[PDB]
Design a protein around this ligand. Structure first.
Ligand SMILES: COc1ccc(C(=O)NCC2CCN(c3ccncc3)CC2)cc1OCCc1ccc(Cl)cc1Cl
Ligand SMILES: [Ca+2]
Lengths: 234, 53
């Protein structure tokens, strides 16, 4: 996360981290329920085997809150393509259920129509992760959060060197040096409503980090709610 | 700004108009209150709520 502030105790309880066999975090994820994690499809190509950690805010210590969970099933969207990054979404079934507590709770899944008319019409949303703090620096050891303004769909396409499909959307700033960066992929994009946070997006891709004239590209969650339900039902 | 377009129909969460009339509902983990608008958590860690002390 370039800029933004750090997630304080219990401010981003739905953050999940994907860690490889070496124990380092490469992608984020969102807690949907005790057994489910929402992530980015493209994140599934960055490791042969990986576990999921919850309740962590500092990657170089033991707040006693941390907890590692093994992935039982990996439900990836079959229509996902690297060539286009479209359908960048995947769900994870854990072998053991998450134990909710301080810093560990789930983000709500909204109704498609309501989400589309009341959540994404809001001024901002929140993106979080352990990604890089600068485009060229290294991974961050502290979980961070960043308020990212919703961007006009038209403006979005104009700024993109790539085709923005209907399954994505822009969030961020045109010039302000705040945006997500690599290592935040698959992380949470939530929108606040009356003190309640709903999962609205999945950190998907971007052309650099916070570059001027560019935005962060998130996976449009409302476009896969039914896919998600189906993915959890079984 | 009429029904749900008017302050989300005064609903805590999901709002939808069923026959020119507001009908509120809640996310998994909550139960609609008796007033039909508020959402009462069903457990200690309802979805979408920050955990503070
Ligand atoms: C250090 O950081 C980066 C350096 C170079 C590239 C870089 O090289 N970008 C080119 C990629 C972009 C995605 N791709 C496609 C290709 C075709 N269609 C759509 C997307 C492949 C090329 C991407 C980087 O990180 C993007 C980080 C990021 C920021 C905001 C949000 Cl919301 C998500 C993320 Cl992951
Ligand atoms: Ca820790």
């Amino acid at each position: 996360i370039v800029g933004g502030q750090e997630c304080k105790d219990g401010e981003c309880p739905w953050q999940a981290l994907l860690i490889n066999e070496e124990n380092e975090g490469f992608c984020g994820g969102t807690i949907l329920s005790e057994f489910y994690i929402l992530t980015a499809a493209h994140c599934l190509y960055q490791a042969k085997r990986f576990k999921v950690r919850v309740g962590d805010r500092n990657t170089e210590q033991e707040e006693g809150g941390e907890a590692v969970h093994e992935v039982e099933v990996v439900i990836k969207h079959n229509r996902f393509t690297k060539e286009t990054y479209d359908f960048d979404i995947a769900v994870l079934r854990l072998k053991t259920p998450i134990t909710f507590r301080m810093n560990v709770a789930p983000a709500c899944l909204p109704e498609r129509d309501w989400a589309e008319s009341t959540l994404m019409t809001q001024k901002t949303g929140i993106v979080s992760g352990f990604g890089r703090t600068h485009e060229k620096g290294r991974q961050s050891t502290r979980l961070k959060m960043l308020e990212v303004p919703y961007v006009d769909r038209n403006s979005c396409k104009l700024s993109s060197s790539f085709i923005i499909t209907q399954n994505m959307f822009c969030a961020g700033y045109d010039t302000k040096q705040e945006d997500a960066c690599q290592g935040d992929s698959g992380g949470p994009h939530v929108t606040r409503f009356k003190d309640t946070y709903f999962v609205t997006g999945i950190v998907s891709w971007g052309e650099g980090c916070a570059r001027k004239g560019k935005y962060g590209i998130y996976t449009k969650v409302t476009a896969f709610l039914k896919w998600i339900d189906r993915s959890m039902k079984t | 700004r009429k029904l749900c377009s008017l302050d989300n129909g005064d609903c805590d969460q999901f709002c939808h108009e069923e026959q020119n009339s507001v009908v509120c509902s809640c996310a998994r983990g909550y139960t609609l209150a008796d007033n039909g608008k508020a959402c009462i958590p069903t457990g200690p860690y309802p979805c979408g709520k920050q955990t503070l002390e």
